Amino acid sequence: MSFTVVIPARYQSTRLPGKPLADIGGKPMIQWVYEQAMQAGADRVIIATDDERVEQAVQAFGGVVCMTSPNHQSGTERLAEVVAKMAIPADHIVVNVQGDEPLIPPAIIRQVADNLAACSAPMATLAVEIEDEAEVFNPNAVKVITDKSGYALYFSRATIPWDRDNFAKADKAIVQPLLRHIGIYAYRAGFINTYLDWQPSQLEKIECLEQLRVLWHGEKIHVAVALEAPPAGVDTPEDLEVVRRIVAERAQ
Amino acid sequence: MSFTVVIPARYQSTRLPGKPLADIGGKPMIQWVYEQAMQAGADRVIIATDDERVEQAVQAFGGVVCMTSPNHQSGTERLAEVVAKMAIPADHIVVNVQGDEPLIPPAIIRQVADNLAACSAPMATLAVEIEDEAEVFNPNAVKVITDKSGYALYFSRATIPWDRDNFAKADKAIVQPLLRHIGIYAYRAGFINTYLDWQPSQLEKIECLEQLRVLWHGEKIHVAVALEAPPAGVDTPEDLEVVRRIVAERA
Numbered sequence: 001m002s003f004t005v006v007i008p009a010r011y012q013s014t015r016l017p018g019k020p021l022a023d024i025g026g027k028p029m030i031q032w033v034y035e036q037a038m039q040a041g042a043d044r045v046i047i048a049t050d051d052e053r054v055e056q057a058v059q060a061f062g063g064v065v066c067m068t069s070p071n072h073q074s075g076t077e078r079l080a081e082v083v084a085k086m087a088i089p090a091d092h093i094v095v096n097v098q099g100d101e102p103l104i105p106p107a108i109i110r111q112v113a114d115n116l117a118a119c120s121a122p123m124a125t126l127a128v129e130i131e132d133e134a135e136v137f138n139p140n141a142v143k144v145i146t147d148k149s150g151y152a153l154y155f156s157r158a159t160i161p162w163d164r165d166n167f168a169k170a171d172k173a174i175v176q177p178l179l180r181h182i183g184i185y186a187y188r189a190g191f192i193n194t195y196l197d198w199q200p201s202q203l204e205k206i207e208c209l210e211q212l213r214v215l216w217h218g219e220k221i222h223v224a225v226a227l228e229a230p231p232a233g234v235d236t237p238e239d240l241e242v243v244r245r246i247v248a249e250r251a252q
Numbered sequence: 253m254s255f256t257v258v259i260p261a262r263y264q265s266t267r268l269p270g271k272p273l274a275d276i277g278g279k280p281m282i283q284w285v286y287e288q289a290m291q292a293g294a295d296r297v298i299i300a301t302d303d304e305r306v307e308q309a310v311q312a313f314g315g316v317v318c319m320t321s322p323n324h325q326s327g328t329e330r331l332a333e334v335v336a337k338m339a340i341p342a343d344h345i346v347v348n349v350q351g352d353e354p355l356i357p358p359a360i361i362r363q364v365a366d367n368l369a370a371c372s373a374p375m376a377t378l379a380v381e382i383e384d385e386a387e388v389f390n391p392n393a394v395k396v397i398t399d400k401s402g403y404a405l406y407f408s409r410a411t412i413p414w415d416r417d418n419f420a421k422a423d424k425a426i427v428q429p430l431l432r433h434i435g436i437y438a439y440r441a442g443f444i445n446t447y448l449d450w451q452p453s454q455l456e457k458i459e460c461l462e463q464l465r466v467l468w469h470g471e472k473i474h475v476a477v478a479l480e481a482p483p484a485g486v487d488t489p490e491d492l493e494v495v496r497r498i499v500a501e502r503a
């Protein structure tokens with residue numbers, strides 16, 4: 001089994017402008033993500049960016065970088081262009097890892113690739129078990145449920161499975177965990193064009209969940225519990241200071 | 253196409269006791285459902301009951317009765333007993349119609365049987381579009397969403413699909429309908445036993461939705477919008493009088 005990791009780097013942010021290049025212990029944020037991907041055993045790692053500053057910084061650590069169009073609308077159109085420009089074969093496993101995750105556990109990057117290779121779905125993703133009321137009823141925490149083979153039945157901002165008996169109480173009891181989707185995906189490279197070209201579903205627009213396109217078109221997404229729950233993506237100066245502390249402590 | 257209709261008619265009811273034998277225009281409620289099933293083109297209609305009062309009454313209008321277990325059974329459990337007891341062949345289509353729907357449109361009984369015959373799936377069912385907030389956010393109203401071919405993705409007591417933008421608002425806006433599942437099923441007779449003997453999912457117990465067992469084992473359930481939206485069933489005395497006046501309005 002071999003797989004390639006593609007990491008989109010988004011330069012623009014009102015809270016952390018130039019985020020991919022934020023210095024963390026002497027390396028830009030994007031380099032840390034790159035290096036987590038290498039530690040996962042990826043045969044190849046590719047930063048996708050539309051900003052020349054990112055290109056230059058990645059070249060300066062010897063990283064592979066693919067320049068993509070500034071006019072893309074979704075991170076799937078972006079991934080599609082990398083697959084085309086870098087000539088990635090249709091059967092090759094690609095893992096999409098967000099460029100704002102410098103502390104992503106390498107084991108889960110490998111996990112999602114391994115899961116895709118082992119199953120009959122063209123796409124694989126992961127979830128974390130949740131049981132705190134905060135996230136269980138939080139529409140920003142996307143819930144997912146699976147069949148006996150691990151294929152997703154549905155993803156939703158609604159609280160799925162609804163516990164009829166325990167959620168009626170008004171003092172809503174949580175007696176078993178739910179599964180919260182995490183934003184890491186593995187695809188057969190050729191499937192990315194299939195996904196891209198499929199007629200958009202109404203479901204995906206109502207829920208604001210792109211992956212519902214796949215379900216609506218009758219195709220499968222494998223889902224597994226992540227081996228280790230990943231830290232949240234870095235969005236603010238406060239989040240960045242937390243990562244700087246963790247990274248500094250990794251040298252102590 | 254040929255199908256059999258099985259109509260469960262439990263006498264005991266907390267909301268309306270002895271309901272299958274509640275009078276409507278001179279006939280017990282059960283007789284009205286039976287007559288609607290006959291109008292649908294059913295090869296055969298079977299009333300499934302565990303009470304001999306229902307048995308006597310159905311035989312008195314000339315209906316076929318199958319006696320089922322007087323112990324607590326689930327929906328599938330009851331239906332599987334009839335299928336097993338009368339040795340219904342595995343490839344025969346069985347439509348399960350509730351004994352408390354005296355005004356069920358014969359056309360939708362035929363629809364669910366037709367839909368099942370038109371595909372390879374072991375199971376078919378129906379839904380109605382809903383927009384009323386009291387139904388949309390009610391866990392007693394089971395929601396369903398389908399793929400592009402009409403196969404169920406999930407059934408839930410949660411409000412699905414969640415409209416991110418519109419349901420965040422203090423007064424939630426319903427800008428497209430949802431689908432409410434209605435309790436009419438068609439199955440391949442043999443599938444019913446498989447369904448019965450399958451390893452149970454956790455999902456089915458949490459949501460209290462038996463049909464999630466099927467989705468968990470990865471088998472398909474086809475779902476279509478009812479060709480005619482059924483009238484309300486009968487759960488309470490109030491509901492009964494609604495039917496009584498509908499029938500009275502005809503004469």
Ligand code: NA
Pocket residue numbers: 249250251252
């Ligand atoms: Na340390």
